[PDB]
Design a protein around this ligand. Sequence first.
Ligand SMILES: COc1ccc(CNc2cnc(C(=O)O)cc2C(=O)O)cc1
Ligand SMILES: [Mn+2]
Length: 232
Amino acid sequence: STVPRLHRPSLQHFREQFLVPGRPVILKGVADHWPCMQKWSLEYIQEIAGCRTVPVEVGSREEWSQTLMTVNEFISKYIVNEPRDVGYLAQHQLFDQIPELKQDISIPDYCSLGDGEEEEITINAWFGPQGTISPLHQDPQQNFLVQVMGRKYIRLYSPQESGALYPHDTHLLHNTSQVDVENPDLEKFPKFAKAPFLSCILSPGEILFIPVKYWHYVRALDLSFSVSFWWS
Ligand SMILES: COc1ccc(CNc2cnc(C(=O)O)cc2C(=O)O)cc1
Ligand SMILES: [Mn+2]
């Protein structure tokens, strides 16, 4: 079934029906008027950030590596010029690096329902072409994933389903599923087929609440820019 969409729910409604129980929801009417929604084109990003160095993941989390290049180089090589490989400006605190871009976003008011300090909220950029794919994984904090450019297909599995997701057994990867969500090996991972899940296509202006430790899988359907807020 699908992730519910709610227009600007009250803090109490979000707290009681989603945050405390740990249920995903898409928040509408919250980020849809942030300046990033109209301002962030490739041209604007090049103007404000083009000369800055960013980490770039090449390949798939299959070979995989991490390199460094300017935002201009990343756009030229992995977005516009028939890219030879998938490259992803992933999980980077771009707004600490470039404060002028921080003016174009806000911290969702709902974060103030957490027990942590606003100063400790981690804001990550996720800027990449169509076709970037995460592994199915879980994170140790709450998350508001804000979609700015393009759309993402997202699949969500409750932590109650962890047994059917076959986490890696190394300590380093125990938060990551061994399963390819969209083409699972059911001969090796048979419990995966009957694990229930939620899914959605997250579109610009929408915020997906990913509860702490909820398993999530993310595939970009277009040229995409998302901003995640990791909070507690
Ligand atoms: C090289 O390819 C990848 C591909 C995907 C990834 C990780 N994917 C995500 C994880 N987490 C969040 C989140 O907000 O917690 C968002 C995304 C996302 O892609 O939007 C890393 C490298
Ligand atoms: Mn994540």
